[PDB]
Structures are given as C-alpha cells and as structure tokens.
Design a protein around this ligand. Structure first.
Ligand SMILES: [Cl-]
Ligand SMILES: [Cl-]
Ligand SMILES: [Cl-]
Ligand SMILES: [Cl-]
Ligand SMILES: [Mg+2]
Ligand SMILES: [Mg+2]
Ligand SMILES: [Mg+2]
Ligand SMILES: [Mg+2]
Lengths: 5, 232, 232, 5
C-alpha cells in the first residue's frame, strides 16, 4: 500500500 | 541540545542543504533544532520537518522489514543460528521507536497546541497519526493503534470542515488513514470506502483549480487509485 | 569499544544482516569490532569490511561533492548567504576524514603487518591507497597524495610478482590506481597507459580461466574499458 | 571515472 509523499 | 547555539534561520538553511545532499539524519537534527526554538513553523518549514523524518524512519522501516522477514524464516526445519537475528532486529526496532518518540515529542511540546489554522493543525495531527502508525507496525499495541486512530480522526474532522476536498493535505491525510485501516486496523472495507469517497469528492472539485493546483491534487489522487487497484 | 563484549562470529553474522538491510554504518561498526578482536580476516571477512566502509564513505563523498559545488557557486554576482554552506561542508568533510582515519587506523593496527599472503596484503594496501585517495579529494595535500601513491605502488609491486594478470584484486587495484593518476595526481597519460596495459595483459590470460572466473575478471576489465572511453 | 566495486 502506498502512503503520502 | 546540540543545535541550541545555532540561529533558527541557519538551521533552516542547513536543513535545505542537507536535503540537497540526501543527508536526512542531519536534516532531521537541524529541523528538530529549529522546532525547539519555540516559534511556530511556516508551511515550507513544516514540509522540511516532514521530509526529514519521513526519510529517516523510512530507511529504518525498510531495514526492520528485512530483518523481521529473516527472523520469521529462522522460526520455521530451519537451523538454529542463535540470538543474533533477534538482537539486531531489536536494535533497529529500538532506534525506529526512538525516532518516532522524538517526532511525537516535538508535536506534543508544543507544535500541536500552538497550531490554530487548519493547514497547520491538520498537518501536525496527520503526522501524529503517521508516527503512531509506524510504532504500531512493530508493536506486539492496542493503545498505540487507538492513538493513531484518534489523531487521524481529529485531523479528518477538521479537514472536512475547513478544507476543500482537493486540498493536498486533506488528500494525503485520507490516503494515510486509509492505509492505517488496511494495514494496521484489519479494516480493508473501511480503507476501500475511504479511498473511494475521497477520490470521488476530489474529482468533483478539480474544476475549481488552477493548472498547478490540479497537478498537485491529481498526483495524490493517483495514489488513492493505485491503492484501490491493489486492494480490489 | 562498544563491540568489545560481542563474539567475533556474532559480529560477522550481524555484518551480513546489516548488508542485507542496507545498514552500512552498522555493518562498518560490526566489522570494526571484528577486526579489533585481533585475529586475521578471511577473504569473505575482508570483503565485508571493504563493502561496509566503501558504502559509508561513498555516501559522504557524494554529499561532500554536492555541498562543495554549492559553495563554489556561492563564491562566484552571487548573493552573500553567510557562513552556513562552508560550515556544513566542513561538518561533512570532518566526518568523512574521520571514517578514513578509522579505516587507516585498522590497517595500521594491525591488519597490514600481519598480512603475509599476497591476496591479503595486496587487498589491504589497495585499501590504504583508496582511503588516502579519499582524504586527498578533500585536502587543500602533497603528503596525503604521496601516501596514497606509496600504498598503491607497494600493492602493485606485490600483485605483479604474485598474482596472475586476471586476478580480480590485481585488476581492481590497477583500476583504482589509474583513477588516482587521472583524478588526483594530474597524470592522465599515466592513467591511460596503466588502464590499457592492465586490460591487454588480462585479455591475454582469459583463456586460462573457468567460466566463473572469466565472468569475475571481465566485469572489472569492462570498468577499465569504460574509463578509457571516457578519458580518450 | 569509475573505481572498483
Ligand atoms: Cl545488535
Ligand atoms: Cl467534520
Ligand atoms: Cl553545520
Ligand atoms: Cl613487481
Ligand atoms: Mg536568534
Ligand atoms: Mg498559533
Ligand atoms: Mg570469543
Ligand atoms: Mg599472517
């Protein structure tokens, strides 16, 4: 899962 | 601490140099020193603080995952190799927890309580949720999970009242809260619902934005979409 | 030091874990602890020592080059920005010099003097040349350059007498000495001649090698060729 | 210039 930059 | 003798403006200048040099531990130390001067942080300064610690903890998290995987493999017809894998995983874990505690300490003394504008308050509460989430990843825990949830929820409540649905801080908060639901709280349906609703409400507000704001918002919307594709 | 209480074998095991986790500072600290046990290092252990410190100093060198470039730009119609760029470049430089001094100290106490086989002695003398070369990159110097030259030259003399021209240690030594000539000693013709002769003598010996040794040697030969293409 | 691995 990708989280925020 | 060691930055107490350096001017606030010099600490900020050096944080920017450290970023250019990819010296994220230095960057984080400079930004900690700047926070400890006691003045509120501007938008650019908040972003420097976040970039620095995200990169530091990101390297620790990646290392912890490598070591944890090796440790789990050793605990399966696996030959006994002694305490070393556990010891070194624990060493990295303790350093990671220390960085999270440092960030949470800056937020509690006294960034959050002095943050009155929505942009700053949501930013810091999102950070609080994130660093409790990183603690939860290594915890073996219910109270840590509830602390992350509570911080994200307060940030969500403010963001929905005070910010447009395309605001990049609001979008990044929703993205990370959705990851919390999926990866930490065992709530994949809540994760999917939040990501979908966030994406759709931002879509409907894009028409209000300039070209540059459109680029900022759609970048984060794409991350929501990437997760939805992975999760469904 | 802090590793004095840990078993030699545990330090080696943890160095390998740190490598897998890309925790090169930890890896270097574990390998320093292993060296300080006072026993000679095996081939695999020498390679762990080299990998660890090469990665640590490599990050410092890259950061130093970024900061030095910014500093040189500031010293051109450039607006005065105060002492901060110089100060932070100096901070990184001092840390880099400290790592080089640490490595040179391990070599002098007592890795080199106990190394009698060509493979170990050449390896350590090459390392001595390399870390003096890194000191020379930031020095503002003649004695440091001569120390690098002297170490590389002793390593070259042994390698030519005791090792075949395809030996990967001999090849990597010649590669790095050629870089010294080009980048440090203002001797591009010597660099080119050394790289050419090294490449050609290895070419003529490839027929003696197994498939796996051929792969090892040709990998380094390609680096010699890459440099010759850049330099000519 | 490339140096050794
Ligand atoms: Cl450990
Ligand atoms: Cl609300
Ligand atoms: Cl500094
Ligand atoms: Cl010789
Ligand atoms: Mg002041
Ligand atoms: Mg305020
Ligand atoms: Mg023992
Ligand atoms: Mg010996």
């Amino acid at each position: 899962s990708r989280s925020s930059p | 601490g060691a930055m107490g003798s350096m001017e606030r403006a010099s600490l900020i200048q050096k944080a920017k140099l450290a970023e250019q040099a990819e010296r994220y531990e230095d960057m984080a130390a400079f930004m900690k020193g700047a926070v400890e001067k006691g003045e509120e942080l501007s938008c650019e300064e908040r972003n420097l603080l976040s970039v620095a610690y995200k990169n530091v903890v990101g390297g620790q998290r990646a290392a912890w995952r490598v070591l944890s995987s090796i440790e789990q493999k050793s605990n399966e017809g696996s030959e006994e190799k002694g305490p070393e894998v556990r010891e070194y995983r624990e060493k990295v874990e303790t350093e990671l927890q220390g960085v999270c505690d440092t960030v949470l300490g800056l937020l509690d003394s006294h960034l959050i309580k002095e943050a009155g504008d929505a942009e700053s308050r949501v930013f810091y509460l999102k950070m609080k949720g994130d660093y409790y989430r990183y603690l939860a990843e290594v915890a073996t825990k219910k109270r840590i999970i509830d602390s992350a949830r509570s911080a994200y929820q307060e940030a969500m409540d403010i963001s929905k009242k005070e910010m447009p649905p395309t605001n990049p801080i609001r979008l990044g908060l929703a993205l990370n809260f959705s990851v919390f639901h999926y990866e930490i709280a065992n709530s994949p349906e809540e994760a999917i619902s939040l990501a979908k609703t966030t994406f759709d409400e931002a879509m409907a507000d894009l028409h209000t934005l300039s070209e540059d704001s459109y680029k900022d918002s759609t970048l984060i919307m794409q991350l929501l979409r990437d997760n939805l594709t992975l999760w469904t």
